[PDB]
């Protein structure tokens, strides 16, 4: 019963999903940054704009 660097290596099924998920999250965060800095942000109840 052994462990190794091939037991934590990511295959091809992860290095394509990770890129798309990082791009989707970064673009939605950039959209919320742009919607806070230059106009309307639909403010959640009980907090400030930031």
């Amino acid at each position: 019963f052994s462990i190794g660097i091939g037991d934590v290596t990511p295959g091809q099924g992860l290095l394509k999903a990770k890129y798309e998920l990082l791009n989707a999250g970064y673009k939605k965060c950039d959209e919320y940054i742009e919607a806070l800095n230059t106009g309307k942000l639909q403010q959640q109840p009980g907090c400030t704009a930031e």
Partner: protein
């Protein structure tokens, strides 16, 4: 408001004379008769209005021949103008549309 003596530059106090109220120095003879209306407005900060109008409030600003909202092109929407801070602010305009299978909030 603080007002200061042109002579010595100490702080003036308001007192009453035989014909008028006066701004008067405590350390020199200078007095200034209040002849006419003088004022100083603070304009403090009012409450938030964001969570106060939501949820079918008692709005009233709707009028005959009012404009339809721009998305639905129906007059099934309220619109209002309010000061958000003190009343020296120019009033901002805001509107919300509520129709069947359609919820939106606009500016």
């Amino acid at each position: 408001m603080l007002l200061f003596c042109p002579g010595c530059g100490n702080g003036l106090i308001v007192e009453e004379g035989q014909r008028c109220h006066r701004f008067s120095c405590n350390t020199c003879p200078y007095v200034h008769n209040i002849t006419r209306k003088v004022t100083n407005r603070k304009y403090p900060k009012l409450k938030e209005v964001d969570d106060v109008l939501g949820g079918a409030a008692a709005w009233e600003n709707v009028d005959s021949t009012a404009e339809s909202c721009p998305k639905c092109e129906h007059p099934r929407a309220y619109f209002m103008q309010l000061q958000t801070r003190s009343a020296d602010e120019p009033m901002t305009t805001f509107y919300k549309c509520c129709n069947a299978q359609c919820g939106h909030r606009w500016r």
